[PDB]
Ligand binder design. Structure first.
Ligand SMILES: CCCCCCCC/C=C\CCCCCCCC(=O)OC[C@H](COP(=O)(O)OCC[N+](C)(C)C)OC(=O)CCCCCCC/C=C\CCCCCCCC
Ligand SMILES: CCCCCCCC/C=C\CCCCCCCC(=O)OC[C@H](COP(=O)(O)OCC[N+](C)(C)C)OC(=O)CCCCCCC/C=C\CCCCCCCC
Ligand SMILES: CCCCCCCC/C=C\CCCCCCCC(=O)OC[C@H](COP(=O)(O)OCC[N+](C)(C)C)OC(=O)CCCCCCC/C=C\CCCCCCCC
Ligand SMILES: CCCCCCCC/C=C\CCCCCCCC(=O)OC[C@H](COP(=O)(O)OCC[N+](C)(C)C)OC(=O)CCCCCCC/C=C\CCCCCCCC
Ligand SMILES: CCCCCCCC/C=C\CCCCCCCC(=O)OC[C@H](COP(=O)(O)OCC[N+](C)(C)C)OC(=O)CCCCCCC/C=C\CCCCCCCC
Ligand SMILES: CCCCCCCC/C=C\CCCCCCCC(=O)OC[C@H](COP(=O)(O)OCC[N+](C)(C)C)OC(=O)CCCCCCC/C=C\CCCCCCCC
Ligand SMILES: N[C@@H](CCC(=O)O)C(=O)O
Ligand SMILES: N[C@@H](CCC(=O)O)C(=O)O
Lengths: 183, 401, 140, 236, 49, 78
């Protein structure tokens, strides 16, 4: 129950820091199917969003301005930003109170904070993904252009940490179910 | 140079002559030369900013900057017969007549809301169910209490909800009159779920769409969008002299518009619809709009129709002796249908579109998460209610001690 | 023309015809109290108290959602009465109220006998009032 | 012996319900396909609806003469009338729409068509855009002395703002039918109560039966307090 | 309102009360068309159709 | 205030999402609401699923192959 808590903090911490949430492969088409080369292709993150093909320069920008569709997504990710932060808040609170219980309700209430982090992270993934399909649908249907959003490495850092928290969510209560019955 | 009346085709980088500047009216120069005899000289106005004698300067602008001053005498081109232009110009009879038109962007699919899951059953039936939930949940309670009992209220808000999501029951009422309620409560759930599923198979198959800024009287009235339009020329001037009150409040909202009261360039006013797409509603003349809507991006659409009746007549600078060979020729091109034959030609040249392109072309997508996105908010938000009651249930047992 | 508020009038006729049956045991059990056993009628009539009151609390929530501001007014003093008749009384605290086994004290039999022909008065003409606004909406 | 009756009745309730959710998702995706007529070239295909205009007016001249070739096909079926699709006059032309019950269309001028749909039996609507554009004119005989005074009048009466006040004057107040088109632009698509109504009547009527059965067993409980069944069964 | 027929039977309608000489000025819903243009005269268009 | 483990709560949860029954049947107002809205969540996802699978199959059945030249006269795609 300590190990799932220990592994839970780092995986989302990598995810909330890294710049590989979302891909993009905005290109074109030609007859004889002759598609494209790269035309506009960015990977993206949560705080630092780094272009890769449209200008090759990684303008990993503290998001307030430019450096057309991309920042429009980043205004919607801004609405979806706090829930991985809220999940990181209740994860660390659940981590500290778990070791204090190692040194009663002190360990049991930590398992409350694993779930309240995880339920923050489910809505965090939902509002993030529903933000993309908002901006997917605002992209005008066009035979030339195309759009290839792709969920990058950070979700396996993030959503697997949701499994880690809920594993640590249920370990803490059986920890409370083995310790209270000894009392 | 404009849309299909006159433009420079790129073959003049090879060709010369009449083939420098071509289009609809360039063919019309041929069949008017069958009666007047006079040849062409295709001179695009470099100053072309259609205009009139300008405000407080009285300088004729652009095309009337070439037509009025004796620099030209025939004006076979798109030119609107204005009454203040009639003050300046002895015209001919109009080719065709246009109206003030609305170029709205082609309605792309709306973003479904967070609560778009309960679209296929209206906001009355989802209210009737909840009161017919309680109104049936209570009647099991009132039946099995004044009759010989595990049916509490809290067990009868569970049987009824246990049947509406079709999940069944282990309670299974045991009277005769407690089974009649649970009998025909089941048959209510067989029809509403099989009308929810049945209707949601009809949104996802035949998706009729809404063009919400149609029927231009409430384009002005229901003020929601950018009242974009062209610059100096005939369109603003008819609204400058607004005396029908429905157009005047439309004009004051254009008079109180910002920053795009006008912009410029019929080509650009297409593009400003094409890229803004949220509120820009480029308010141009009629027959230019059906060119853009037809051509092949198929991304604009004409809502409403023909807010005025304004004509395309050949302008002759006030007496201008060629006008009588001009207007008699046009009559022999109109009654013979030669201009109508030219209308039949030049508006069926390009790749045809509309519902013509909307034939047997559907591919329908899978549901995104944004279609059912509210159910997870009800699901997760349903959990934070039940964990809240857990702490309140645990509080009223510990403080019972 | 069936509407939502028209369903709220069909539903109360199902419910208030049992609510007038709740208060037919208000007056026949007092008929057994005036002819006479007390703790039997105490144990019986303490039960059907929160049923006959919270069904009335349902409709004030209902016609708010039905947005019928007339009939919401035409029962809100009784909800004010059902609240006020409640909250002073459960100071005995056995299950709810309405008997307090020494019910045979004076001046409370007749004050509830005022209520015996007050509920059977108000529910009966409201029963034909909901049936009135049922048909007023159902064929409009 | 007793699970097979419960076996195939479980199969019978899978095919009837799954047939029922099939066709109820086949009314609703068929009567959603039905596009109303919205343009003349759409009406050019739709041979189901009868489209006749006014006889001996300018409109009958318009379909005969021009060659936009949607109209040539429109004139062609209009010339192949069965029976006579021209009516003779507009007031008789409204009634032929009124009495065909969504089967006779009637081509007429815009300024008259807007007034007809603003009349107390509101069951008409202006379908598409204008097929063309013309103008109303005040007529003088060919080269008479009355020509230019009236011609100077309408020029003067324009910028005085009177003739477009008259445009309002006999039309602006004429929404006396009620203008019920104003509250119907949603064209909503969910089921209403009108679709699923008989279920609630079965729902309420089930409750009204079940209370009376709850009464009929309580009285049978109390009247029971105060070979008999076999001979009663043997008779029945 | 006004039209033209087999020989001419002149201009059957309200223009038959106006080109025949039955009456002068013809304030009416009469619509300007080019067959009417050549046979009688008109004002300026005062409404749009 | 036992019969719910963590594995006996998986088996209720999977039982409700494929809409089959469950003998388990929770008992507390804290504990019936989790089973309440999960019962609502499994009504919208399945009824969305039988919607669109009856919307691929009634869309790709509408597709008429080209069979005549005047049909091909409209079909500017090919
Ligand atoms: C028989 C039926 C009983 C359940 C009722 C059916 C559920 C759907 C009906 C419903 O109406 O729900 C949908 C509601 C809102 O729909 P609306 O038409 O009321 O408002 C209009 C929409 N708007 C919010 C934009 C204003 O969406 C919401 O907010 C979510 C609330 C609905 C949650 C249903 C299950 C909750 C169970 C709770 C405890 C029960 C356990 C018993 C012990
Ligand atoms: C048993 C429960 C019965 C009934 C519950 C009913 C209430 C449920 C909550 C309704 C959610 C809501 O009505 O609000 C939705 C917001 C709007 O979307 P948005 O604010 O993110 O902005 C996006 C930008 N726009 C708005 C332009 C698209 O969604 C959000 O707030 C995202 C978070 C949603 C709020 C509650 C979910 C979990 C919260 C705490 C745990
Ligand atoms: C925490 C416990 C669950 C809370 C909600 C369910 C019960 C409360 C209720 O909702 O009911 C109030 C009481 C229930 O009484 P009970 O002893 O049968 O509890 C059940 C019998 N046991 C003793 C075996 C449990 O009174 C009744 O009977 C109510 C009779 C019907 C009145 C309909 C009220 C609907 C109003 C809705 C708007 C708010
Ligand atoms: C003492 C306490 C009083 C409580 C008051 C509530 C109880 C009674 C009030 C019910 C309110 C609604 C019922 C009547 C009011 C409106 C009915 C109505 O306006 O239209 C009558 C129809 C039947 O007439 P129709 O077919 O000619 O349709 C005519 C319609 N048109 C021509 C347009 C197609 O609707 C019907 O009443 C359908 C009849 C009911 C369903 C019959 C099947 C029985 C259902 C469940 C019991 C299980 C049976 C077991 C054996
Ligand atoms: C029709 C639906 C109802 C029929 C069966 C029925 O009336 O409800 C079950 C009955 C009554 O039960 P109860 O003793 O609680 O009520 C009596 C009350 N108390 C305790 C005061 C004696 O008892 C039973 O199990 C069944 C009694 C034996 C049935 C003999 C005749 C068979 C045919 C019956 C109707 C025709 C069906 C086919 C068409
Ligand atoms: C995951 C699927 C399985 C979950 C739990 C499980 O393995 O099956 C139920 C277990 C095993 O039962 P058993 O004694 O019959 O087999 C043992 C064989 N014998 C009788 C010979 C000792 O016992 C139980 O009730 C539960 C045992 C207590 C669980 C403590 C850890 C909580 C988390 C478990 C996995 C994470 C879930 C969330 C992600
Ligand atoms: N034909 C118009 C073009 C400009 C406009 O549409 O406003 C004119 O000459 O004034
Ligand atoms: N006012 C019209 C009526 C006939 C028509 O609508 O074509 C006319 O004089 O020609």
């Amino acid at each position: 129950s300590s190990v799932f808590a220990v592994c839970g903090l780092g995986l989302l911490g990598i995810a909330v820091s890294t710049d590989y949430w979302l891909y993009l492969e905005e290109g074109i088409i030609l007859p004889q199917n002759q598609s494209t080369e790269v035309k506009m292709s960015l990977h993206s993150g949560l705080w630092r969003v780094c272009f890769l093909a449209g200008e090759e320069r990684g303008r990993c920008f503290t998001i307030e301005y430019v450096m057309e569709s991309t920042v429009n997504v980043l205004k919607m990710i801004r609405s979806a930003t706090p829930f991985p932060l809220v999940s990181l808040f209740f994860m660390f609170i659940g981590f500290i109170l778990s070791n204090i219980g190692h040194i009663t309700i002190l360990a049991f209430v930590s398992g409350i904070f694993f779930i309240l982090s995880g339920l923050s992270l489910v809505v965090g993934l939902v509002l993030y993904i529903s933000s993309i399909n908002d901006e997917m649908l605002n992209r005008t249907k066009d035979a030339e252009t195309y759009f290839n959003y792709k969920y990058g490495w950070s979700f396996a850092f993030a959503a697997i940490s949701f499994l880690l928290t809920e594993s640590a969510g249920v370990m803490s209560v059986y920890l409370f179910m083995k310790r209270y019955t000894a009392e | 140079l404009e849309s299909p009346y006159v433009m420079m085709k790129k073959n003049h980088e090879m060709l010369e002559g009449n083939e420098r500047y071509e289009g609809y009216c360039v063919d019309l120069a041929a069949e008017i030369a069958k009666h007047c005899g006079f040849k062409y000289k295709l001179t695009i106005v470099g100053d072309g900013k259609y205009g009139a004698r300008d405000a407080d300067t009285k300088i004729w602008n652009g095309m009337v900057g070439e037509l009025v001053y004796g620099k030209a005498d025939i004006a076979i081109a798109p030119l609107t017969i204005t009454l203040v232009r009639e003050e300046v110009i002895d015209f001919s009879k109009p080719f065709m007549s246009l109206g003030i038109s609305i170029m709205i962007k082609k309605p792309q699919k709306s973003k479904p809301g967070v609560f778009s899951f309960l679209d296929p059953l209206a906001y009355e039936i989802w209210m009737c169910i909840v009161f017919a939930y309680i109104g049936v949940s209570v009647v099991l309670f009132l039946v099995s209490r004044f009759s010989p009992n595990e049916f509490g209220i809290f067990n009868s808000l569970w049987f009824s909800l246990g049947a509406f999501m079709q999940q069944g029951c282990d309670i299974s009422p045991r009277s005769l009159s407690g089974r009649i309620v649970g009998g025909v409560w089941w048959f209510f759930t067989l029809i509403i779920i099989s009308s929810y599923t049945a209707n949601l198979a009809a949104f996802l198959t035949v998706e009729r769409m809404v063009s919400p800024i149609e029927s231009a009287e409430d384009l002005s009235k229901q003020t929601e969008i950018a009242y974009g339009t062209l610059d100096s020329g005939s369109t603003k001037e008819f609204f400058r002299r607004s005396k029908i009150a429905v157009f005047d409040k439309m004009w004051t909202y254009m008079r109180s518009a910002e920053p795009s009261v006008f912009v410029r360039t019929t080509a650009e006013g297409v593009a400003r619809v094409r890229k803004s797409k949220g509120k820009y509603a480029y308010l141009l003349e009629s027959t230019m709009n059906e060119y853009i809507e037809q051509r092949k991006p198929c991304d604009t659409m004409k809502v409403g129709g023909n807010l005025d009746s304004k004509g395309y007549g050949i302008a002759t600078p006030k007496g201008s002796s060629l006008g009588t060979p001009v207007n008699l020729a046009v009559l022999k091109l109109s009654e013979q249908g030669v201009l109508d034959k030219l209308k039949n030609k030049w508006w069926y040249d390009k790749g045809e579109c509309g519902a013509k392109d909307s034939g047997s072309k559907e591919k329908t997508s899978a549901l995104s998460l944004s279609n059912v996105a509210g159910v997870f908010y009800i699901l997760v938000g349903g959990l934070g209610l039940a964990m809240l009651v857990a702490l309140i249930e645990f509080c009223y047992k510990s403080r019972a001690e | 023309a069936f509407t939502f508020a028209a369903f709220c009038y069909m539903l109360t006729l199902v419910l208030c015809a049992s609510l007038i049956f709740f208060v037919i045991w208000h007056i026949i059990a007092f008929d057994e109290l005036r002819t006479d056993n007390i703790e039997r009628i105490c144990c019986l009539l303490r039960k059907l108290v929160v049923p006959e009151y919270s069904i009335h609390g349902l409709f004030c929530l209902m016609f708010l959602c039905a947005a019928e501001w007339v009939t919401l007014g035409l029962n809100i003093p009784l909800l004010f009465y059902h609240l006020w008749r409640y909250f002073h009384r459960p100071a005995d605290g056995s299950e709810v109220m309405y008997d307090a086994v020494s019910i045979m004290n004076a001046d409370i039999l007749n004050y509830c006998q005022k209520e015996s022909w007050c509920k059977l008065a108000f529910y009966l003409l409201s029963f034909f009032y909901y049936l009135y606004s049922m048909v007023y909406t159902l064929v409009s | 012996s007793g699970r097979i009756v419960g076996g195939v009745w479980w199969f019978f309730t899978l095919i009837i319900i799954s047939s029922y959710t099939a066709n109820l998702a086949a009314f609703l995706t068929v009567e959603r396909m039905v596009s109303p007529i919205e343009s003349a070239e759409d009406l050019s295909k739709q041979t189901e609806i009868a489209y006749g205009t006014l006889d001996s007016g300018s409109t009958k001249e318009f379909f005969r003469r021009s060659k936009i070739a949607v109209f040539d096909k429109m004139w062609t079926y209009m010339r192949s009338a069965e029976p006579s699709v021209f009516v003779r006059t507009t007031a008789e032309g409204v009634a032929r729409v009124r009495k065909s019950k969504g089967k006779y269309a009637y081509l007429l001028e815009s300024t008259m068509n807007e007034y007809i749909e603003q009349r107390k039996p509101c069951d008409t609507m202006k379908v598409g855009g204008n097929l063309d554009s013309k103008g109303y004119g005040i007529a003088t005989p060919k080269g008479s002395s009355l020509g230019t005074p009236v011609n100077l009048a309408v020029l003067k009466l324009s910028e005085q703002g009177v003739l477009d006040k008259l445009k309002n004057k006999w039309w602006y107040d004429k929404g006396e039918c009620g203008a019920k088109d104003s509250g119907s632009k949603e064209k909503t698509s969910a089921l209403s109560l009108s679709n699923v109504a008989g279920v609630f009547y079965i729902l309420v009527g089930g409750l009204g039966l079940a209370m009376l059965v709850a009464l009929i067993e309580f009285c049978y409980k109390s009247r029971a307090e105060a070979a008999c069944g076999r001979k009663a069964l043997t008779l029945l």
